[PDB]
């Protein structure tokens, strides 16, 4: 029964969106999940909800894949893409009962999506990455979730300093691994650092006599460790021939438990060589270091040569109340990467943990502004705005395109309807007002939780990057196709 | 876990079992025959109409059927033709017996009748025999081919099968000596490569095996060079090179002197061993392990192609024709301990880059291995079976010039003769001799049922012309030609083969009808 | 018997029925592994992935596996046509009481009828070379369909069109190289004769080498022993071992002396090279490449035109490769090396610029098979009208031959045409257009002249396929009939299933 | 729809084996089970078998109309209409066709099929002997389905000579069928005398020539005619009897008032008392009594008499006329035979069979055959049978599929496929290979030769004109006409709604 597979896929998929429908909005409700390991989680973060859910229905697992795509595409809207998809699926159920073939539905949704993206451009507030003011204004929207927003004006240009340096307006794709957020326990947001190089999680030297740092030094990027079996110093001294000959004033040795990263005596031998010592450098952190430095790792000590070193302005260890933070400034290698790192300070570990997540979101906000220059209104204003321009133009459509595009219009209301429900306002009263405000008034009008009603979101300063809404329409139209196109579920072997 | 059933009712259980055996093989008889799906123990899918493989892969638990199969093996082993007809005829002979049992005919009275009725049938068949080899030797070759095509035109090769008959008739002409008056079918090996087409099969006058020369700088063809002892093949287990273990070494090297010292050992053993190839008398060398590159280049100056990793049986097949030996060491080799041929050449076949090795004597050889190709791996398996069977078709046509014009016509001709002797019985045996005809009719009936013809009226159509007209061949039209007369269609079966079919089937009646108890004991 | 025998094929058809067409529906695969969630309309993946129980259904799988390697396309149409032929036969067997061989013989007569129709409709352009080029665009226009590339097909059309026009001669398919590059929408792909490898050459050698002499070594050059490999470092003093390796360095240089004996500018090795024999290549001025895999060795043999060179004993008595330009470049966010103008090389490389891995996985199969189809259009210049036209053209001729034929065989020939009319029916249903209206209107067109019409499944009508440019291969469609003809012969001959002792 | 159309398919399965002179019988078992019946009469089969699917109640009623209207084609219509539904199933589940599209296509094709039956019609108005020879060939088909398959050649003359001699009104009341026990089937004979099966009269003239017949509907037995609740509380039996004797005197006057007409035969529907009858003796009048309505109603129109329920005054009524009124005793049973009756074209077929169990079926057989032959005098166009017309019909339907739109094409071909099942059922019931015989006729008729048909005796294909298998233009028109009507009704049914059973 090929129709029953499609009927089952829609019924099953809608039950996934029914889980997320309650989480949309800053006042939204929380979900509790008891995981297979017995740990019970509770949060309103949608991607976290779906990440720890592990839905067993393989078709419903595609909705989780879309969430991750939303996170890697824009970095926000992880709940908006799921709720939007659920509306397309519920609208699809109506289209199926009306007797529309799955392929007519899918291609018709794709065509409506093409206009939807154009409409999003029509409502776009043109900005630029040179707008140093609005960039902060955009961050302050996402920093409304900040636990202590008295520090929001400190993290605001902090994210700008990270990106404005490595990616100006003349840029396309920003790699969020190039801006590595490295948190340090204690302090306050009064102390944040835009580090134009790398920040290491390991200290330098516990022994006395250590250089602890070297200015105008070369960086050793080595995966091969120095491990002996008079012979104790003779071996390390024999290796000193490879250490010194490379012209390396800083060795950063990958953590390996088979062979000691830095020999116990090497702390003293490199103090004679004036070489900065860092040992037990996590391999997963070497994934950060061995790439950003622009040089290549040494898999055999004999390969440790001059060309494989970095040329750093300074490799320094910052010691403040027991910190001892190894970092580099001015990597300035011909093959280097624009690597910036952020030093995060806060009350306790629980605060800097949350800060890293919010700074990651802030970088996603700017990354949205890099990929797509321009801002759009919040509060579901773009969703009501499209439904007006869509349904106003849909009257001119002919054929089955008129009925599917009209159903698409009704599905676009799932966001302002959900925003109103989770906000505690009558869903009819709110949507009705939004219709009259976008029809006669400004496209900036939307739902305001601050004023307990529908107000101008531009005047209330609720703005979001256009990429969130464009990627929501894009991935949703791709998802509703991928779900509608499932014709059978077969055991594989 | 034993059986208990008393009285002749046990024989009803035995015969009803045979009806199950027949219901399997029945539909496989005829060139319009239906195939069986064979589920291999490992899951391999085999599709065949050959009753020998159908019976071989047929698994049945009733011990009566295990007897039917084990005895049918003698039809495949001794003759190699109509194993299918042995089971089909035997089932009909047992089916008519089931009627005789209910009529109250004593089991032995049944068996005595089938024996004497066969004495009548085989004799009446001889009265109608024909000499396929009559007149000239060129006519023998002609009719030998015309019949060989009848066995090959029934398989997947039927499109261009005349080419498989080309190699078949010419092979047995090369492999048969009228002074010997016999054909040793083991002198012909069946071998091919997976893939290809019918036209890619070749008639090879000598030995070909799935091997190619191991070094591309060595000559693809070795000759005696005008007067030497042909081309000798070294059949050894170890290579001509400085000794090097194929498991573990464990040679301690104390210094640079000792390190390179082995290369000095290798240089002398390189030239010594490749000289020991020439001194031993090998023109090419085939060993179970491969040969050192530096030895290989020293072999080049002497034109000494070589092959690595070869089993003994494959080189034995060569050594059969070349009189080679597996001598433990290369030092005891001679022009005779190493077997001799005239030419070894490596043949490429269009897009086939395998480039197989062929060993010939530059004359009439003592063995041939013909070359088979086909568009599917499984087609090749059956195609070589067609060459196996068509090899036995001509093998029997050589053994006995007496042939019968078949297609069920001989069975109907014999059936009519049995009905002629029915009136001369006028006794208890009249009940049984008549049933022998009813059983002989099940062969032409089965031939018609597998062809889509009227199962009853076809019997009357054949009997009408073989009774009111003449003993002229009136066969079944399963081939889809116009009408009867297999003499016109040149569809011919061996006389001695049909005799063995009748006599062996009678033996099956003696075996099944005379078993009164099936005692199946257990196992500890 | 046959109630259990032939029914196995009906299931195979339903497994693939929904996968055929430009708008085909997808199948979901998931195994007991739980991590094998795959969504594909690819018939090769679907046919190979689905386990089957009925051994007669396993026969149809093996039949289509041959189609996959023999042609590389049409594997869906083989399973569809072969299944509908058996489904029509199942109805003949029960309803009319038709002998199994009678059905077999009818499909044989119908096979000749279909071959005649496809022959009559052959349209070729060996004249007007420009139109042959356009036909290659149209054949790719149809062959590049059915993929997730359907949004970007126009760009892939020119890419594959130039690739087949690049061979401009022998149909050597290995001349074509496909590079999977991450980054960008698929319209960023480009065709380049550079025969891209992902490795560079030399330690410090000039990145542009012109009029190069390329020598390929196929063996291990990491501590390369002159055939003394197999000795051990077994000494009572560590210092003696290092000396033993220096003895290898004397042997490596003797191998390098034989390798450099050729007088070469460039050198390529299958395996890695130890710093010393590599530094000898560097010091000798030789552009040295290492760690080439099977395709590195095999393609260079077909590109540079040399040997694996197991023997370095003389500058001659073997092929030595050549390249007009050896260009090392940073391209595709990976250091690439480009061989341009190889030994009489008429080839090119297609570089795919996709977004992610799964997308490049499908385009790899798409372009691999797409050029495989086009490789047959050089030898076979006769083309066929697509859009379901040819299927309807065959259905007309089969009905024509059914006009003059005997009874038991006429029931099968008519059924053969009904099966041919299921091919355009499945296409229309998978596109979501009235499966009855479109197929019947095709019949009125082909019956009353108009031997150019077909389905416009983009606009939902029936149109002249020569205007829309829906073109098929004579050999492709001939193989669809031919493979199906043999497929039916095999399955229609099944009378029982016999099990030998199972393992 | 799925169940609404399939509901009726079972009806075809009940009758699919009844088609053809070689057909097979159905065994009926009553609720008491002791009155089992073996019959191939399709109308009896459809009327006897209760069917619980409402869709079958419709199709059964459709066939009842054809039984009373035509009298033949009960199986032909029921089977053809069932095959239309068997084709419709495939047009629904596997095709996705709207019911109305199926309806419009079946209507379209029914028009073309009527044209094929028209184009192939052959009539013989000249050479009335050749029409007689065709009537023989027609009877050779209508006499099928009975043990008459052995003696059919003889019954063709019994029926052909009757309809040949009718040469007048096709009212079947002019022809009577009589079942007499004794004799073999071939011993039946045709008699022009429209024999009445009873003799009455005590001492009455058994031979009347130049007779005037008075059929009577009155009471000439005893008194108190239509008098209820009248009792005689009398002290003298003369006071009671005088009133019956007075009515006997009134009958003695009505015997004279009857006699004053000039009557020589008096036939009464009710009993006549010995004395009122006895007075007819001296009058020269044969007095017949207790003749039932079924008989005298046809005598009213065969003898040309009058009912004359009131005899109170002479010269007030009409009379009949008969040349010879005589008593004929055959089959150990006396009969009253008439000859030279008003409208003298009358006749009767007298059956002389072994047992009434066999005569009952032959009676209905000739009854239906007389119906068919009667209609062939008004519609003298004939067509070739044996599936010849059915295959010629299918040829024309294919022609419509050559020029047809897209939705109706699948339905036009279905109408043809149903027509090709008609010769299929014939061949299967004859026990021959239908797959070859149907396709052999298909190739014979498709490739010209519009002559051939199914030879049920030899299992082959031969000319129907030489084999003598012909059927009426009107019969085949009704088969295809009522079939398209049967589908028009059943194809329009989408749901079954039930008012609560009573």
PDB file of N, CA and C in Angstrom, chain B residues 3-36:
ATOM      1  N   UNK B   3       9.809 -48.286  10.220  1.00  0.00           N
ATOM      2  CA  UNK B   3       8.513 -48.324   9.560  1.00  0.00           C
ATOM      3  C   UNK B   3       7.784 -49.607   9.928  1.00  0.00           C
ATOM      4  N   UNK B   4       6.455 -49.530   9.976  1.00  0.00           N
ATOM      5  CA  UNK B   4       5.619 -50.710  10.139  1.00  0.00           C
ATOM      6  C   UNK B   4       4.431 -50.607   9.197  1.00  0.00           C
ATOM      7  N   UNK B   5       4.419 -51.465   8.177  1.00  0.00           N
ATOM      8  CA  UNK B   5       3.258 -51.630   7.315  1.00  0.00           C
ATOM      9  C   UNK B   5       3.305 -53.008   6.670  1.00  0.00           C
ATOM     10  N   UNK B   6       2.195 -53.737   6.767  1.00  0.00           N
ATOM     11  CA  UNK B   6       2.172 -55.150   6.427  1.00  0.00           C
ATOM     12  C   UNK B   6       1.259 -55.354   5.225  1.00  0.00           C
ATOM     13  N   UNK B   7       1.627 -56.303   4.376  1.00  0.00           N
ATOM     14  CA  UNK B   7       0.877 -56.586   3.169  1.00  0.00           C
ATOM     15  C   UNK B   7       1.406 -55.836   1.964  1.00  0.00           C
ATOM     16  N   UNK B   8       0.768 -56.109   0.822  1.00  0.00           N
ATOM     17  CA  UNK B   8       1.149 -55.447  -0.421  1.00  0.00           C
ATOM     18  C   UNK B   8       0.873 -53.949  -0.368  1.00  0.00           C
ATOM     19  N   UNK B   9       0.122 -53.492   0.638  1.00  0.00           N
ATOM     20  CA  UNK B   9      -0.097 -52.060   0.806  1.00  0.00           C
ATOM     21  C   UNK B   9       1.216 -51.306   0.965  1.00  0.00           C
ATOM     22  N   UNK B  10       2.257 -51.976   1.465  1.00  0.00           N
ATOM     23  CA  UNK B  10       3.566 -51.338   1.561  1.00  0.00           C
ATOM     24  C   UNK B  10       4.116 -50.995   0.181  1.00  0.00           C
ATOM     25  N   UNK B  11       3.792 -51.806  -0.828  1.00  0.00           N
ATOM     26  CA  UNK B  11       4.262 -51.520  -2.182  1.00  0.00           C
ATOM     27  C   UNK B  11       3.528 -50.328  -2.779  1.00  0.00           C
ATOM     28  N   UNK B  12       2.280 -50.104  -2.361  1.00  0.00           N
ATOM     29  CA  UNK B  12       1.581 -48.881  -2.734  1.00  0.00           C
ATOM     30  C   UNK B  12       2.276 -47.644  -2.173  1.00  0.00           C
ATOM     31  N   UNK B  13       2.768 -47.726  -0.933  1.00  0.00           N
ATOM     32  CA  UNK B  13       3.585 -46.645  -0.392  1.00  0.00           C
ATOM     33  C   UNK B  13       4.859 -46.455  -1.206  1.00  0.00           C
ATOM     34  N   UNK B  14       5.470 -47.554  -1.654  1.00  0.00           N
ATOM     35  CA  UNK B  14       6.721 -47.449  -2.399  1.00  0.00           C
ATOM     36  C   UNK B  14       6.507 -46.829  -3.771  1.00  0.00           C
ATOM     37  N   UNK B  15       5.446 -47.231  -4.474  1.00  0.00           N
ATOM     38  CA  UNK B  15       5.208 -46.705  -5.815  1.00  0.00           C
ATOM     39  C   UNK B  15       4.779 -45.246  -5.743  1.00  0.00           C
ATOM     40  N   UNK B  16       3.894 -44.916  -4.802  1.00  0.00           N
ATOM     41  CA  UNK B  16       3.464 -43.530  -4.648  1.00  0.00           C
ATOM     42  C   UNK B  16       4.645 -42.608  -4.382  1.00  0.00           C
ATOM     43  N   UNK B  17       5.701 -43.122  -3.748  1.00  0.00           N
ATOM     44  CA  UNK B  17       6.927 -42.346  -3.603  1.00  0.00           C
ATOM     45  C   UNK B  17       7.561 -42.063  -4.960  1.00  0.00           C
ATOM     46  N   UNK B  18       7.604 -43.069  -5.836  1.00  0.00           N
ATOM     47  CA  UNK B  18       8.233 -42.883  -7.138  1.00  0.00           C
ATOM     48  C   UNK B  18       7.503 -41.828  -7.957  1.00  0.00           C
ATOM     49  N   UNK B  19       6.183 -41.721  -7.782  1.00  0.00           N
ATOM     50  CA  UNK B  19       5.425 -40.694  -8.490  1.00  0.00           C
ATOM     51  C   UNK B  19       5.899 -39.298  -8.110  1.00  0.00           C
ATOM     52  N   UNK B  20       6.445 -39.143  -6.902  1.00  0.00           N
ATOM     53  CA  UNK B  20       7.003 -37.854  -6.507  1.00  0.00           C
ATOM     54  C   UNK B  20       8.306 -37.572  -7.246  1.00  0.00           C
ATOM     55  N   UNK B  21       9.166 -38.583  -7.371  1.00  0.00           N
ATOM     56  CA  UNK B  21      10.392 -38.425  -8.147  1.00  0.00           C
ATOM     57  C   UNK B  21      10.066 -38.007  -9.577  1.00  0.00           C
ATOM     58  N   UNK B  22       9.083 -38.663 -10.197  1.00  0.00           N
ATOM     59  CA  UNK B  22       8.748 -38.357 -11.584  1.00  0.00           C
ATOM     60  C   UNK B  22       8.196 -36.944 -11.727  1.00  0.00           C
ATOM     61  N   UNK B  23       7.333 -36.522 -10.798  1.00  0.00           N
ATOM     62  CA  UNK B  23       6.760 -35.182 -10.853  1.00  0.00           C
ATOM     63  C   UNK B  23       7.822 -34.090 -10.852  1.00  0.00           C
ATOM     64  N   UNK B  24       9.047 -34.407 -10.441  1.00  0.00           N
ATOM     65  CA  UNK B  24      10.157 -33.463 -10.515  1.00  0.00           C
ATOM     66  C   UNK B  24      10.782 -33.517 -11.902  1.00  0.00           C
ATOM     67  N   UNK B  25      11.284 -34.693 -12.287  1.00  0.00           N
ATOM     68  CA  UNK B  25      12.044 -34.805 -13.527  1.00  0.00           C
ATOM     69  C   UNK B  25      11.162 -34.773 -14.771  1.00  0.00           C
ATOM     70  N   UNK B  26       9.864 -35.055 -14.642  1.00  0.00           N
ATOM     71  CA  UNK B  26       9.036 -35.222 -15.833  1.00  0.00           C
ATOM     72  C   UNK B  26       9.154 -34.017 -16.754  1.00  0.00           C
ATOM     73  N   UNK B  27       8.985 -32.812 -16.208  1.00  0.00           N
ATOM     74  CA  UNK B  27       8.822 -31.631 -17.048  1.00  0.00           C
ATOM     75  C   UNK B  27      10.134 -31.183 -17.677  1.00  0.00           C
ATOM     76  N   UNK B  28      11.233 -31.879 -17.395  1.00  0.00           N
ATOM     77  CA  UNK B  28      12.542 -31.531 -17.931  1.00  0.00           C
ATOM     78  C   UNK B  28      12.847 -32.226 -19.250  1.00  0.00           C
ATOM     79  N   UNK B  29      12.014 -33.175 -19.670  1.00  0.00           N
ATOM     80  CA  UNK B  29      12.279 -33.940 -20.877  1.00  0.00           C
ATOM     81  C   UNK B  29      11.840 -33.161 -22.111  1.00  0.00           C
ATOM     82  N   UNK B  30      12.791 -32.903 -23.005  1.00  0.00           N
ATOM     83  CA  UNK B  30      12.486 -32.332 -24.293  1.00  0.00           C
ATOM     84  C   UNK B  30      13.211 -31.024 -24.533  1.00  0.00           C
ATOM     85  N   UNK B  31      13.435 -30.685 -25.806  1.00  0.00           N
ATOM     86  CA  UNK B  31      14.089 -29.404 -26.111  1.00  0.00           C
ATOM     87  C   UNK B  31      13.227 -28.198 -25.779  1.00  0.00           C
ATOM     88  N   UNK B  32      11.907 -28.360 -25.732  1.00  0.00           N
ATOM     89  CA  UNK B  32      11.009 -27.370 -25.154  1.00  0.00           C
ATOM     90  C   UNK B  32      10.848 -27.533 -23.649  1.00  0.00           C
ATOM     91  N   UNK B  33      11.777 -28.225 -22.992  1.00  0.00           N
ATOM     92  CA  UNK B  33      11.643 -28.585 -21.593  1.00  0.00           C
ATOM     93  C   UNK B  33      11.689 -27.413 -20.635  1.00  0.00           C
ATOM     94  N   UNK B  34      11.067 -27.576 -19.472  1.00  0.00           N
ATOM     95  CA  UNK B  34      11.066 -26.538 -18.451  1.00  0.00           C
ATOM     96  C   UNK B  34      12.201 -26.754 -17.460  1.00  0.00           C
ATOM     97  N   UNK B  35      12.765 -25.649 -16.978  1.00  0.00           N
ATOM     98  CA  UNK B  35      13.935 -25.704 -16.117  1.00  0.00           C
ATOM     99  C   UNK B  35      13.528 -25.830 -14.650  1.00  0.00           C
ATOM    100  N   UNK B  36      14.490 -26.242 -13.830  1.00  0.00           N
ATOM    101  CA  UNK B  36      14.335 -26.290 -12.382  1.00  0.00           C
ATOM    102  C   UNK B  36      15.269 -25.278 -11.735  1.00  0.00           C
TER     103      UNK B  36
END
